[PDB]
Ligand binder design. Structure first.
Ligand SMILES: *[C@@H]1O[C@H](CO)[C@@H](O[C@@H]2O[C@H](CO)[C@@H](O)[C@H](O)[C@H]2NC(C)=O)[C@H](O)[C@H]1NC(C)=O
Ligand SMILES: *[C@@H]1O[C@H](CO)[C@@H](O[C@@H]2O[C@H](CO)[C@@H](O)[C@H](O)[C@H]2NC(C)=O)[C@H](O)[C@H]1NC(C)=O
Ligand SMILES: *[C@@H]1O[C@H](CO)[C@@H](O[C@@H]2O[C@H](CO)[C@@H](O)[C@H](O)[C@H]2NC(C)=O)[C@H](O)[C@H]1NC(C)=O
Ligand SMILES: *[C@@H]1O[C@H](CO)[C@@H](O[C@@H]2O[C@H](CO)[C@@H](O)[C@H](O)[C@H]2NC(C)=O)[C@H](O)[C@H]1NC(C)=O
Ligand SMILES: *[C@@H]1O[C@H](CO)[C@@H](O[C@@H]2O[C@H](CO)[C@@H](O)[C@H](O)[C@H]2NC(C)=O)[C@H](O)[C@H]1NC(C)=O
Ligand SMILES: *[C@@H]1O[C@H](CO)[C@@H](O[C@@H]2O[C@H](CO)[C@@H](O)[C@H](O)[C@H]2NC(C)=O)[C@H](O)[C@H]1NC(C)=O
Ligand SMILES: *[C@@H]1O[C@H](CO)[C@@H](O)[C@H](O)[C@H]1NC(C)=O
Ligand SMILES: *[C@@H]1O[C@H](CO)[C@@H](O)[C@H](O)[C@H]1NC(C)=O
Ligand SMILES: *[C@@H]1O[C@H](CO)[C@@H](O)[C@H](O)[C@H]1NC(C)=O
Ligand SMILES: *[C@@H]1O[C@H](CO)[C@@H](O)[C@H](O)[C@H]1NC(C)=O
Ligand SMILES: *[C@@H]1O[C@H](CO)[C@@H](O)[C@H](O)[C@H]1NC(C)=O
Ligand SMILES: *[C@@H]1O[C@H](CO)[C@@H](O)[C@H](O)[C@H]1NC(C)=O
Ligand SMILES: *[C@@H]1O[C@H](CO)[C@@H](O)[C@H](O)[C@H]1NC(C)=O
Lengths: 121, 431, 187
């Protein structure tokens, strides 16, 4: 909530993003894949001397299709590819002894707790 | 009853994909700037840490949802300069290269129908000082530790993703979703899609102008119906706003204490007697925060199910042609186009509808010479006096020949067989 | 472990240890402190159980998806796009993992593409010929018919196309000859 001062220290490398004012990071004109998300399209990383750099994340390579009205492209060879998919199916089963957790071995606490048995059930 | 004409229909589907990301400063909400209340609250730090863990889990899940729906392909295709698509006009859904935001006309219409609670995420302290505080609802939230975090992808990046998907589909058909994009003329792709619902190619190639006109008219109707609808996307905004304002309003409860104001209690009472009142207030306000976080978790689960459905639709309706009934609209699915909306996605489903039906008498088989003839891929019909074979979804009568049927058995077993002649188109040539 | 750590909270009592309270205090005054502790610890258990319920719902959705994948990718061949991997699905193999499952999806990917000129139909004798199940392509000088996903050129014959109408309606029709592989045998 600062537009670059209500900051703990100013230092240098003061850079303004739509996520706020970023202090302690160098701004570069490249566009890499996102390492640490900062927000509003801005990401950060630790690069090469080593320093924290802040950049705009790239969405991918840009290639244009060669479209015409009398032109088709047919494959001539193939590839057989094997890929893996991981799925969770179950979790740990747990049980709780209500009196053991709340009172331990205190008889007086158990006599007092007898008023709340429905909740433990 | 066999249809004789068709209709090309375009319909819309709206899906929510993400919700607002929020964070809470526990001490700011419960104690404000009271040092004594903070020293008393130091006994409950685990609960505040637990609440913040739950909220950060929700917040990262939202970005994962948006990534899963929109970021399937990592090749940013560009639409060709030459717009020669066989008479189909996609100008209304392709990006306008003159507006600041590179959004299509329909996306611009959609973005003006959902009103976000706050535009921008930089509200400075000097902006609301004095009167403006406690009147404007965002500053009232922010003076009590309640902050809204910005999403990772901006609107422009999502518009880029949708435009890449559109260019891919209209230049390469469905090949770009399985591997490298292979270019193909748009009319030949349309003929393939007609083949995929059981209608021969010549139907498309003969009726091309009518089909193109129907598509353009349907897109125009969509446009004129939007500038005149998005409740599923407005209710998410309303629910998040209402929850934050309810948290702000619940700070006036006594919870069985003398007052709800910490400063009123701290004056007029000494520490040993003020401690019990402050403790009551602390317990009540921790309960309010707990209830808020639980209901946020349940809502996040619902949004996650909706976003999984949207990703499945993007894979199976836009990157291919779906044969499951009513998944990609009403009618025989032809193709789909995605558009981005605030917190969601809109799908434009183009489907095929049979139009004008006529009555015919029919028969299972034909008995020629003690043999039973069955259609290879059609149905036998009669106009009253003569017998033809046609295709099931469009009326195109033809003469029954041997290159047109197949034989199996005699005529003693089929229940409703009829007598007719089979041309056998070889005898004239042999003579 | 968070449930175990939350046992050191006072919840507004003199101490968090029951034995410390029970000594040094008589029953009527110890009852109020014990009651505070009891309320706090019941709340901790309630919060734990609620978050366990929400997590169990998420695991149940994941397991339903895994069962659907087992039915449709391993016990059959799926035609829905990207359900059983990237590419045209051929087959799948399951493997068990601790608390879960791994699927091995074997798919088909088209590799090396070549450019051809194409046409919707062929005009032979005032008739329009369309491919039965292929596409018409040209290497520059000659015209063949092939299959869409693999390049295997063949000569256009009448046992290879089908006729519909004349040549006045199809937008991009081209002129070529159709073999008709019966005339040589009849002669
Ligand atoms: C921080 O404040 C600067 C200074 O006003 C803002 O820059 C202005 O933004 C408005 C908004 O459109 C423009 O009309 C002005 O022309 C800008 N002025 C200058 C000198 O750039 C900026 O918008 C603020 N930062 C954020 C993130 O809101
Ligand atoms: C189709 O692709 C395969 C590769 O997937 C080609 O086979 C390779 O051929 C090179 C030399 O031509 C060999 O060095 C490799 O060892 C071969 N690979 C395998 C797995 O045997 C094949 O030749 C290609 N066919 C055509 C017609 O291009
Ligand atoms: C099939 O339906 C279309 C309408 O969807 C018919 O085309 C219309 O024909 C009328 C007059 O016959 C014109 O006034 C309309 O402008 C036409 N519509 C369009 C979009 O061009 C078509 O004639 C029908 N064909 C048959 C054989 O009934
Ligand atoms: C495709 O559709 C667009 C939008 O309807 C057409 O552009 C319009 O053309 C009319 C005149 O016919 C103008 O009055 C509108 O102002 C135009 N709209 C825009 C946004 O430019 C366009 O002519 C159609 N055809 C092609 C080939 O693009
Ligand atoms: C049923 O179809 C038959 C065959 O197409 C129709 O017979 C044709 O009728 C037209 C119009 O009179 C003639 O020009 C053709 O020469 C006829 N063909 C033959 C083979 O006779 C017949 O009219 C149709 N029956 C009804 C009741 O519409
Ligand atoms: C296009 O295909 C035709 C037909 O296959 C090719 O013509 C053949 O060329 C080979 C190599 O010179 C000859 O051995 C054959 O006898 C030719 N067949 C006929 C029917 O002429 C032609 O070379 C191809 N064109 C190009 C530019 O590659
Ligand atoms: C980045 O680009 C801007 C304008 O394009 C330029 O002023 C700035 O110096 C550039 N930064 C670097 C490190 O080159
Ligand atoms: C087909 O015949 C039924 C029987 O009377 C009739 O109700 C129906 O309208 C007919 N269909 C058409 C398209 O005329
Ligand atoms: C159809 O019903 C009539 C009686 O209405 C009957 O005579 C005829 O055999 C039936 N045909 C078939 C194929 O069931
Ligand atoms: C069809 O022809 C056979 C013999 O030519 C005859 O027995 C049969 O009754 C005929 N079917 C009719 C008249 O419906
Ligand atoms: C097909 O033609 C286009 C047009 O220049 C070209 O860019 C593309 O590389 C060609 N494809 C192949 C496989 O050569
Ligand atoms: C393809 O485009 C050319 C102009 O570039 C045009 O002359 C030709 O008729 C078009 N063919 C088809 C089938 O659209
Ligand atoms: C195909 O042949 C017809 C008549 O033989 C002719 O009118 C037409 O122009 C030809 N198509 C061409 C030259 O593209």
């Amino acid at each position: 909530d600062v537009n670059c001062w209500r900051v703990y220290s100013t230092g240098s490398n003061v850079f303004q993003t739509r996520a706020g004012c970023l202090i302690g990071a160098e701004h570069v004109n490249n566009s890499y894949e996102c390492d640490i998300p900062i927000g509003a399209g801005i990401c950060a990383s630790y690069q090469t001397s080593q320093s924290i750099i802040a950049y705009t994340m790239s969405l991918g390579a840009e290639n244009s299709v060669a479209y015409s009205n009398n032109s088709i492209a047919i494959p001539t060879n193939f590839t057989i590819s094997v890929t893996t998919e991981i799925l969770p199916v179950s979790m740990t089963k747990t049980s709780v002894d209500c009196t053991m957790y709340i009172c331990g071995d205190s008889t007086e606490c158990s006599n007092l707790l007898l008023q709340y048995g429905s909740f433990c059930t | 009853a066999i249809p004789t004409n068709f209709t090309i229909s375009v319909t819309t589907e709206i899906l929510p994909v993400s919700m607002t990301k929020t964070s809470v400063d526990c001490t700011m909400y419960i104690c404000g700037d009271s040092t004594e209340c903070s020293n008393l609250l130091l006994q409950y730090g685990s609960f505040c840490t637990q609440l913040n863990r739950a909220l950060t889990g929700i917040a990262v899940e939202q970005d994962k949802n948006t990534q899963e729906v929109f970021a399937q392909v990592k090749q940013i295709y560009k639409t060709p300069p030459i717009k020669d698509f066989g008479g189909f006009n996609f100008s209304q859904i392709l990006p306008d290269p003159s507006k600041p935001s590179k959004r299509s006309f329909i996306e611009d219409l959609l973005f003006n129908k959902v009103t976000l609670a706050d535009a921008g995420f930089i509200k400075q302290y000097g902006d609301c000082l004095g009167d403006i505080a406690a009147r404007d609802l965002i500053c009232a939230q922010k003076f009590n530790g309640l902050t809204v975090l910005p999403p990772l992808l901006t609107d422009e990046m999502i518009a880029q993703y949708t435009s890449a998907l559109l260019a891919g589909t209209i230049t390469s058909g469905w090949t770009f979703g399985a591997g490298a994009a292979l270019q193909i003329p748009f009319a030949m792709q349309m003929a393939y899609r007609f083949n995929g619902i059981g209608v021969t190619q010549n139907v498309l190639y003969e009726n091309q102008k009518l089909i193109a006109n129907q598509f353009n008219s349907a897109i125009g109707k969509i446009q004129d119906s939007l500038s005149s609808a998005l409740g599923k996307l407005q209710d998410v905004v309303n629910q998040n706003a209402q929850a934050l304002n309810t948290l702000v309003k619940q700070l006036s409860s006594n919870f069985g204490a003398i007052s709800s104001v910490l400063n009123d209690i701290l004056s007029r009472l000494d520490p040993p007697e003020a401690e019990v009142q402050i403790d009551r207030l602390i317990t009540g306000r921790l309960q309010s925060l707990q209830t808020y976080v639980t209901q946020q978790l349940i809502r996040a689960a619902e949004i996650r199910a909706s976003a999984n459905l949207a990703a499945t639709k993007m894979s199976e309706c836009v990157l291919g042609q779906s044969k499951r009934v009513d998944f990609c609209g009403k009618g025989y699915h032809l193709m789909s186009f995605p558009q981005s909306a605030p917190h969601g996605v809109v799908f434009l489903h183009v489907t095929y509808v049979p139009a004008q039906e006529k009555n015919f008498t029919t028969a299972p088989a034909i008995c020629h010479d003690g043999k039973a003839h069955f259609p290879r891929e059609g149905v036998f019909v009669s106009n009253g006096t003569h017998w033809f074979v046609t295709q099931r979804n469009f009326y195109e009568p033809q003469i029954i020949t041997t290159d047109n049927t197949f034989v199996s058995g005699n005529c003693d077993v089929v229940i409703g067989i009829v007598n007719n002649t089979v041309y056998d188109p070889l005898q004239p040539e042999l003579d």
